[PDB]
Design a binder for this molecule. Structure first.
Ligand SMILES: Nc1ncnc2c1ncn2[C@@H]1O[C@H](COP(=O)(O)OP(=O)(O)NP(=O)(O)O)[C@@H](O)[C@H]1O
Length: 327
């Protein structure tokens, strides 16, 4: 109770006056390239003073502009510097220079829920429930700050060194008390009210939780087809069919999450998230023990120079200064 009001205070202070240039490139030893994103390399770095390892995402400002990802990139950074929750990736530092934006993230030698789910095929209900519980608490947290996530899917969930989820992508997340209109997400996870195009609210996250739980437990999502139009028709007008192996409790929870009418959808009623937390399917879930990450995860990921080292070259001339003023 009193912790949500404190969580709200801490978020609002940071949301209204975001932190900027909290570190600089010369404070990090550049070890090697971890991978490539849309806008540049992700590099393993060591903070010289603390000796902590981080994943430094390098975003070429010129490329962010060319791909029209300015607003998404600024939005994601503003949210990440303000939020604090066990299942949200942690932005430790941010800064910018003439060429680049730098998001110095907590280093997670984990796996991706997407590749893990696709390799295993499907999760048992107890294992799906373990992951689902984390998403329920995360949506509870984000919704208490009036954040709509609206991009849930296995692809946006990393599995960390302790086998817990971290939500990794906030480009699409919006701070909004009530209704909003922007079309976004991935076809298979779109809530019917998004497709119906007369506006939607935070209830779209509870729909997407239904899609995620179904996909984890079945190994495939409830609505799919060769073309996005046929998916949209099934979402708005069609019925789900549950595999025979789904428990009665799972089918009941999913009937109330995959509820086409947002006014009857669990998470969106008078009792809010408690209709989900107190559902029979979650009877065995110790919500505090999940939050405190005291539950044994069912899967632990099995975690020198770059093949060709490329140096970072920062221009002596400022690129796209006006666009990224607030970064
Ligand atoms: N916090 C992190 N800790 C460790 N490795 C990371 C971290 N973030 C990213 N990586 C690595 O960098 C790669 C590409 O970065 P990533 O953030 O996934 O790209 P993006 O621009 O966010 N888009 P995407 O590749 O679709 O996820 C990942 O596949 C990982 O190998």
């Amino acid at each position: 109770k009193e912790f949500l009001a404190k969580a709200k205070e801490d978020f609002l202070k940071k949301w209204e006056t975001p932190s900027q240039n909290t570190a600089q490139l010369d404070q990090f030893d550049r070890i090697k390239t971890l991978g490539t994103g849309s806008f540049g390399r992700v590099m393993l770095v060591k903070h010289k003073e603390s000796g902590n390892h981080y994943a430094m995402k390098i975003l070429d400002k010129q490329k962010v502009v060319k791909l029209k990802q300015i607003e998404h990139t600024l939005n994601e950074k503003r949210i990440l510097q303000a939020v604090n929750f066990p299942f949200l990736v942690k932005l430790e530092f941010s800064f910018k220079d003439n060429s680049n934006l730098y998001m110095v993230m907590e280093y997670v030698a984990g796996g991706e829920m997407f590749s893990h789910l696709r390799r295993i095929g499907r999760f048992s209900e107890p294992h799906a429930r373990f992951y689902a519980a984390q998403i329920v608490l995360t949506f509870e947290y984000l919704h208490s700050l009036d954040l709509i996530y609206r991009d849930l899917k296995p692809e946006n969930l990393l599995i960390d060194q302790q086998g817990y989820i971290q939500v990794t992508d906030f480009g699409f997340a919006k701070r909004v008390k009530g209704r909003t209109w922007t079309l976004c997400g991935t076809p298979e996870y779109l809530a019917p009210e998004i497709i119906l195009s007369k506006g939607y609210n935070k209830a779209v996250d509870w729909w997407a939780l239904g899609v995620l739980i179904y996909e984890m437990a079945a190994g495939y999502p409830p609505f799919f087809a060769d073309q996005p139009i046929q998916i949209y028709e099934k979402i708005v007008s069609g019925k789900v069919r549950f595999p025979s192996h789904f428990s009665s409790d799972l089918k009941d929870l999913l009937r109330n999450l995959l509820q086409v009418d947002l006014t009857k959808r669990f998470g969106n009623l008078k009792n809010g998230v408690n209709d989900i937390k107190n559902h029979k399917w979650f009877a065995t879930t110790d919500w505090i023990a999940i939050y405190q990450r005291k539950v044994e995860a069912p899967f632990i990921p099995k975690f020198f120079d770059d093949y060709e080292e490329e140096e970072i070259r920062v221009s002596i001339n400022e690129k796209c200064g006006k666009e990224f003023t607030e970064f």
